[model samples]
Target: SEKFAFQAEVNRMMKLIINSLYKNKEIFLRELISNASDALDKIRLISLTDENALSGNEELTVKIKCDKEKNLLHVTDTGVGMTREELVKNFLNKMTEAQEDGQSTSELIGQFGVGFYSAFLVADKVIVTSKHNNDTQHIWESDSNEFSVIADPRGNTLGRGTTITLVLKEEASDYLELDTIKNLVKKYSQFINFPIYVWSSKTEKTVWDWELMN
Candidate 1:
C-alpha cells in the first residue's frame, strides 16, 4: 500500500469528494486564498499573546509563485500552519466516522474539506508544505485518489505558515499566465483584508533591450 496508506472507506470517501464536489477549476485559487486569510487571522490572534510576532511582517500578505518549468503554482503566506492531525484529517483523506446519532461533526477543516479536493480539477497531483510555530513543518501530497504526509526534509523555509502548491495540468495552463492570474485576483480578491502579491517575473522587464549590454 505504498501508493497510499488510506483505508478502503476513507479512500472511497476521498474519491467522492474529489470527483463529485470539485466542480469549478478556478475555485482552486479562491480556496487557497481563503485559507491564507484564515491563517492570517490565526497569526493575528496569536499576536495578542506575542507582540513581537509582527515585527518583521507588519502587513499580512499572500504570495503566488508559478514554476512553469514544473507546471506548479504555489500559494504562500506568513500565517498559521497545519498540525499532524489536521493534515491527516484534512489533506491525506476524508474521515467518515460518525457518532452514535449517525452524525459526523469532528471534521477539522471549515465546513468541509472540499477546497483541498478542488486541486483535482486542475492538477493530477498537489503538494503542500507547512510549518506551525509550535511544531515542525511537514509536506502533504496527494494524487487525487491517495496521499502521503511526511516531515519536510528541507526544514522550515516558511517561518510559520502554509504553502499550497498546485502542479498545473496541460489543459489548465492558463492559470500559469500572469495576466490571467492578475485579472482573476483583481476580480475575486482585490479588496482582501491583507495585501496580496503575485510574484510575477514577467512584469516590468527591460523595454530597451540595448540597455542590458550597457
Candidate 2:
C-alpha cells in the first residue's frame, strides 16, 4: 500500500454511508459482487455478437480475497472497468434518478453507487484496481468521505476486471476470518451464478477453497 484520504463534501456522504445500511451489513458484499456479475454478463453477451467486444480478454468470473494481516478485503471481477470520467459520473454523482416500486430509484440493480460507500461501515479506507481491455489500468481510492481515481501501479493485473479493496477498521476484524466471510458469501450468494472460494493454510478439499476461485 499506497495511502489516500476522502474529500470534505464526501465527508457528509460518510454519515449516510455509515448509518444507512446499519441493519443489513452483509448484503453489501452480495450487492457489490452481484453488480460485478451483471456487468460481466453484459460484456460476455456482447462479446458473442460484436466479436471485438471481448477481443482483449475473454475469461469471465468474480473473485474475493482477504488480507488479514493488512486488514484488507478485495472483491474482484473480470468485467468492464470504468473510465476516469465514468468513475466520477457513476461514483461521485447520483446516477440513479427516480424511485422504482418505492425501492432505490435507480432502475439498474447496481445503479445505487452506494455499494462502494458501504465499505465505510467496516473499513477506514478503500482502494480499487480496475482495467478495461480498451483502457489502461486505474486505481480508485477513498476514505468514506470522498474519493480519487488514478493510474494503477500494478498495471492491469487482472487484464480486464475491477478489484475493490477494503481496509478494515479495528472493530471489523471479523471480516478477515475465513469461515465467517465464506458463510456470509454462501448465505447471500449461493445462487450467484458463480463460484466463491477462500485461501487456506491447509490442503483444501471443498468448493469454497483456495485451489478453486471464481
Candidate 3:
C-alpha cells in the first residue's frame, strides 16, 4: 500500500501534521495519496482482524475529483473516519507533553501529515470533511495556528473515511485539470495497492464520470 496504516490514531496525528508547515510544491500529490492510502490501509488492517470493522463503511478507495468552475480539488477516501469527540479532543482539548511524548505519531503518520499540510502549498483554504461510523460527520478546516470543526448537521453527507477540499491557489490552477491529477497519481503513486479513482470526462461529451485508474 502506498499510504499504509496509522491505526485508529489518525485524527490525533492529523493535528500533529497541521501543527507546522514546510514550503514545497507538487510533491503533495504523492503525500495526499499516502495520506488516504494510510487510512485505507488502516481500515484494511481492521477488516483482517475484525469482521465488523468495516460495518462503518463497506467501500474502501481513494478518489480525486476536481471542479474547474468551482476552482476546487477534492480528494476522498472511505476509511475509518473520526468522531466529533475525538476531533475536539485533539484540537480543543489540546495535549500535554506527557500525552504527546508517550504516544507514537510519526512511525505511522509520516506521510499523511505532510500531504495534508502540503495543501497549504497550493491552496488558499483547506476543508476536511470526515465521517465516522460512531459519529455523523464533521468538517475540520484551518488557517494560521487556529482551526474549526463542525458537525455536518444535515447528518452524514459522506460515508466513512475522510475527504479534503483544496481550494486551488489561483496560480496553481494547472492541477485542477483532470488529466494533471491523473498523471500525478500514476506517475508518482505507482505502487498503491488499492484502486485510485480520478474523476474523468470519459463520457466523450458534456457529462463526466469517475474512471478507476488503478
Number of the predicted model whose TM-score against the real structure is largest: 2
lDDT of 3 by residue, 1-214 (tens): 0112233444454445444333336666877888787788887987899887887667788889998999988999987777876555542233334246666333233432434565766877778888876668887776434567777766777768988888888788998887778878887567777878887875535766678777
lDDT of 3 at 65: 90
Per residue, candidate 2 scores C-alpha lDDT tens digits across 1-214 of: 3334555655655565555467766656767777677768778777878777876666677777888877889887787777666665543344222222234422232454455566777878877777776788888787655567777766767777788888888988988987687777766666566555556545335353463433
TM-score of each: 0.74, 0.76, 0.75
* lDDT, candidate 1, 1-214, per-residue tens: 1244666756665565454434445766766777887789888898999978765346566887777788888888788678766787763334333323355332333356445655677888888898776777888888766788888888867777788888778999989887687777766575367667876553345331111000
Number of backbone collisions per candidate, in order? Answer: 0, 4, 2
> Which residue pairs in model 3 clash with each other?
4-38, 79-161
Per-candidate RMSD vs. true structure? 7.6, 5.2, 8.5
How does candidate 1 score on lDDT? Answer: 0.69
Residue 89 CA displacement from its true place in model 3, Å? 5.1
Which numbered prediction scores highest in lDDT against the true structure? 3
What's the true lDDT of residue 203 in model 2?
32
Residue 202 CA error for candidate 2 (Å)?
A: 3.2
